[PDB]
Motif scaffolding. Structure first.
Motif, short mmCIF file in Angstrom:
data_model
loop_
_atom_site.label_atom_id
_atom_site.label_comp_id
_atom_site.label_asym_id
_atom_site.label_seq_id
_atom_site.Cartn_x
_atom_site.Cartn_y
_atom_site.Cartn_z
N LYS A 1 0.84 -1.21 0.00
CA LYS A 1 0.00 0.00 0.00
C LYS A 1 0.87 1.26 0.00
O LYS A 1 2.02 1.20 0.46
CB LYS A 1 -0.92 0.01 1.23
N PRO A 2 0.36 2.37 -0.57
CA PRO A 2 -0.71 2.50 -1.56
C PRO A 2 -0.23 2.07 -2.94
O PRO A 2 0.98 1.94 -3.17
CB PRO A 2 -1.00 4.00 -1.56
CG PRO A 2 -0.60 4.46 -0.20
CD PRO A 2 0.64 3.67 0.09
N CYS B 1 -5.61 5.39 3.95
CA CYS B 1 -5.52 4.24 3.04
C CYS B 1 -5.89 2.90 3.73
O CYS B 1 -6.60 2.10 3.14
CB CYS B 1 -4.10 4.17 2.49
SG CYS B 1 -4.00 3.49 0.86
N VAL C 1 -6.87 4.93 -1.72
CA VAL C 1 -6.34 6.18 -2.23
C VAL C 1 -7.47 7.16 -2.49
O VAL C 1 -7.30 8.37 -2.32
CB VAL C 1 -5.52 6.00 -3.51
CG1 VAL C 1 -4.92 7.32 -3.93
CG2 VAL C 1 -4.41 5.01 -3.28
#
Lengths: 375, 378, 377
Positions: free
Chosen positions: A112-113, A202, A354
């Motif tokens: 992530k992201p 996120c 996101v």
């Protein structure tokens, strides 16, 4: 009886790419004998490593006794004997590389992201779906024993009707003057992609979506609590990132959740993260590992007078062994690829994170609530 | 504000009637200023004491400055200025004394049991219904804070669906040889109404009926564990009563209850009595004052294996004290007194006392006849 | 100095079979260099593992340095080279296989129940006796340190006259919905042999007989607390066996024993089973491993009165020996019996007594009355 899976790995040798995925997942699955299937047979992963500079990414291969490493990415990209791709490197470089692997026809997996902005993230999803490759992104916090416990409390009807969620995140990241900062300095520079909102919101996307209900709207204000910090080299710099933020969420079904998150707060609670769930029939407080419950029949009856309230709660027993969360998700993606086992955690989900972070930053900037457009 | 209640109490000379009913109930109520009503008024008991011997009754009347007493029960009943009767004396003379007070129009409250047998007891319940007077019998165990919490749990859906009930009752009553017996010796003599079955099964009727669902049948075996015991004089006697008993109850709504009860068992448990309640969604274990819970989410996952010590007691949480708990004998009094003066709803009629005798007799019968015995609806 | 014992093992693979018998008994015995006989000889087990699937039996044979394995029980039983047969699989199949082993001339050792049926158990006993082969059934609860301690308390007169026995057995067996069942699902289907009564009342027959006195009569009632549960494969199935039961037993010498037993109870006690013994001179409460005692002189004097710690009034017995695996110990006892005429109480007859009490108990339930335990002619 026994098969082979090619796997190229970018950004391994983090920080935590090394730890969580390399050590605790790939090498872990390797040693145990490989991934299980449906009809008993097993999948053996054949890794091929990729970093940045070959003089520091040298030994790792035989350090765990694997096979191959190269400095040039295109080298492992090319091979058709490698049918899968993983990446845990920089944020901005990631989507471009996902594209290249997706083009190359590889099933995709990453940290992530997935991108810096929603547009970029969304297009990567579309590339993956169009090609017909399998894709996945890490959603680690879901696999924390603490949150695994919340889910169990949910499923088994403990809360009755869930009402509200209180999240308290973070710890005091040192400014670097007297004690070295526990976290990399890019995290505190706006122009290098730093920011607690786009970092943590996120995660909260999937935590909230999966445990309590789909996020519909957010209000969020961030701040820069500390103006000056010190480099990995002891050099001071203007800290421009939000290092604290305060968000409230409305969830589908009526649940409200509030999460305070900060790198500039000191810890007077059970863990580095805490999630309190108040339900009509009981409440829970989860941490990284443990989870405390108070059934409604155990709720005391205090009154305002200008007692250990913690003692009114009981710790959940550990009834299973808890595998490393990264590894467990690695095993689920592999089942998706080679067995058509259903999979929730595609790159779509990364994109949602996101999207939510951007909704939050926009709520800051425009001083109002912001609705999460369905995709 | 202050109304008057003419109450005649009979068995207040003895051990329980003095301490529980007179002292901790009536005297307590008087000193509070009476029983508060919904409308704000207070009912004051002006008691008159009986108890057989005059020289020892006025001394008893003097300690709590009660202004009224006699040795003449029959005239005390004739006196229509008194309107309520209470008995805490002998069980053998009780149903007849109740009969006299009912015939004379008195409201009637009494200790356990209501009679020596079910036929006699049923007669009195019918008589009291026939006359239209208010009647009640003591059901003390139901007011144990422990069992109060069980009820709370039941009402609030903690258990989900109740499945089984385990009762463990009793403690070691010294035989008399080297230590004074805790308990009067008439209890260990069958020929004097002694016996744990008809002492306790009487309680169990209501504990079961009210917390768990109505008793439909009982298999029970008693026994005399200790052949010989010593008097309150240190005189040896032969024990003829049952001092232990094991009973299993089938309850309305498909619950099974089992109770071990003994005066010849040593105590390894939270309290002098213990009820474990197992439900679909959680369990509880209650003693006299406290209650522990384990919601199903907190149930551990042990597996059969003959190493590291594990503390099962620690998987349980102690319910909080969210209310004041009053003397259970006192509460039921006030409850009955409101039933008579303000029509307050009150379940614990002599009908309930008859059910108790019905069960003891059933249990004794199942023992005698080696079989399960169904509890005929009244 | 060394003698080789050819043993066919059938029921292993299952959790209890593999752990207690294969690993902790036979493999341990192998690893100490065999059962030590009286003169000095050591009897070495050379096992042959038997399972209905070849992949799951070859690996198991492998990782314990074994050598021999098959899926063909029938061929294994006719070998003649192998001299003893052990079964720890299904109770439905047990008498049949026991009967082959006996007629093939083999010694027989097995888990309980020995059959589903009292009359079926009795023919198996009678047969093995006609053939003069050595036979035994597992009676493990008696080898629990907790219950070895209770025996010591009896033998050394701690109790005076034992008066009564309160038994508490069981723990919450997860239904399978949100948590996985601790036990195989067959136990919860009447049609597949399930039922707490016929499973545990077998143990209770030997526990009470040896420790406290012969079971003369039982009254018992079963129930099925949970109508539905989930398979090992997550399949909903209809639960048809008794999962809870409450038995009172009258024993020789005037002693009454009561035992609650349940897969649907939660645990508020010292262990997964607990035995209290109340005697004239003292009492004891045993678990699997520990035993608490309260001599009569230590008995306190509470009076009834609506804070004191009653658990504190007991003393925990010291461990004065090392306790070995109870299964391992009975194995050694059986092997000595076979190889040097050692005294051995634990023959199939004892197993047969076990099935009889279960049947007496189910009958007692069915006909709603106490059922006397008839002698075996």
């Amino acid at each position: 009886t026994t098969q082979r899976l090619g796997l190229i790995m970018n950004g391994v040798t983090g920080r935590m790419g090394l730890n969580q995925h390399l050590i605790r997942s790939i090498v872990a699955i390797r040693d145990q004998g490989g991934v299980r299937l449906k009809n008993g047979d097993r999948i053996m992963p054949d890794p091929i490593l990729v970093g940045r500079s070959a003089e520091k990414v040298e030994a790792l291969a035989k350090r765990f006794n694997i096979a191959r490493w190269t400095t040039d990415l295109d080298a492992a990209l090319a091979d058709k004997n490698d049918t899968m791709f993983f990446d845990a490197a920089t944020t901005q470089a990631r989507p471009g590389l996902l594209t290249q692997a997706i083009n190359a026809g590889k099933h995709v997996y990453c940290e992530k992201p997935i991108a810096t902005n929603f547009e970029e993230a969304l297009e990567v999803v579309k590339l993956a779906n169009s090609k017909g490759v399998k894709h996945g992104t890490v959603q680690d916090k879901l696999f924390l024993p603490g949150l695994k416990k919340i889910a169990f409390l949910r499923d088994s009807g403990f809360f009755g009707r869930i009402l509200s969620v209180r999240g308290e995140f973070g710890y005091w990241v040192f400014e670097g003057g007297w004690q070295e900062a526990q976290r990399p300095s890019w995290n505190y520079r706006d122009e290098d992609g730093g920011g607690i909102i786009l970092d943590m919101v996120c995660h909260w996307r999937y935590v909230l979506d999966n445990l309590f209900g789909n996020v519909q709207s957010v209000v969020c204000i961030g701040n820069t609590d500390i103006p000056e910090r010190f480099d990995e080299q002891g050099k001071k710099y203007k800290a421009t990132a939000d290092d604290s933020a305060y968000a409230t969420f409305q969830l589908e079904g009526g649940v409200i959740a509030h999460i305070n998150m900060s790198w500039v707060t000191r810890v007077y609670r059970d863990d580095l993260v805490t999630f309190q769930v108040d339900g009509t029939h009981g409440s829970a407080v989860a941490g990284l590992s443990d989870c405390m419950i108070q059934a409604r029949q155990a709720t005391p009856r205090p009154v305002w007078n200008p007692h250990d309230f913690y003692g009114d709660w009981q710790k959940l027993p550990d009834n299973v062994s808890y595998d490393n969360g990264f590894k467990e998700q690695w095993e689920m993606f592999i089942r998706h690829v080679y067995e058509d086992a259903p999979y929730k955690f595609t790159l779509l989900e990364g994109a949602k994170g996101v999207q939510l972070a951007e909704c939050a930053l926009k709520s800051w900037k425009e001083r109002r609530w912001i609705d999460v457009a369905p995709i």
